[PDB]
């Protein structure tokens, strides 16, 4: 399953999150990880210490990161059943 | 509304809680932080049946107590919210 | 033997605390009983600080809610001693 | 004045009750009665160690919290009493 901005929210689900320790601890970790990067990176447009530019761009690369971390914990999640 | 054991999972979603993020500051955060640690509360305490080093009474005994502590922040952040206007 | 110029005296905290070893149906009716005299003794003197009663009508109230704790006081004490509390 | 569970003892003295008798009336038995209930959770608080159908573990837990409710209860009182002129 890929991963991208704009499905962020409709696979990183409560669902989906319920679904071994060394495999389920980290992963668990790692998915939840990018739930909590991905709405503070939401809120970066809230920041009026930020011009327009800059809480774009940050959004855009955190956004990036909860992405490449979900990525990378449904993979491994995949690759364990 | 009065939340309970048996109706948190139904209102501690994913969807009431981006209804929150329309609030100012000083009601937006600490009704999400109230909220959200409800949520893993609740979430946490599931996970004491899983715990093969408690007992049956143990575990159960534990899950009641963290999840009466859930269910109060949980009314909590829904009492702060409905009186900011949310309606969920 | 309670009367109003001994009962502060009498009704302290570490009396009360005494009652805590009763056993349980005597305990909280002696307990009850103990700490209402003290709470009735101590607002005795509450309406001469309200402009609404009269001073006369105070001090009758005064008076009369003072001698009430004092025998409500020394029904508890009897009880507890009944028990064997000692005072 | 900062109420602690460590300093309640030492504030919430009959000396200290008895500068509320000087409270104007829309504000005196109000703010008596907050002291008064306050002095009587912290008081009673350790009630459920002499409870032998209490679990002492239990009791511990009814007790500090208890205690934080009456602390906060006494702190209400003192600072209402304060913003209304009381020098404790």
Same mark, same amino acid.
Not at 47 to 50: K, W
């Given at each position: 399953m890929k991963i991208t901005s704009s499905n962020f929210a409709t696979i990183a689900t409560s669902e989906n999150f319920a679904k071994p320790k060394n495999h389920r601890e980290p992963i668990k970790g790692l998915f939840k990880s990018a739930v909590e990067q991905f709405s503070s990176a939401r809120d970066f447009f809230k =920041?009026? =210490?930020?011009s327009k530019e800059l809480a774009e761009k940050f959004n855009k690369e955190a956004v990036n990161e909860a992405v490449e971390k979900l990525q990378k914990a449904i993979d491994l999640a995949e690759k364990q059943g």
């Open positions: =920041n009026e =210490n930020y």
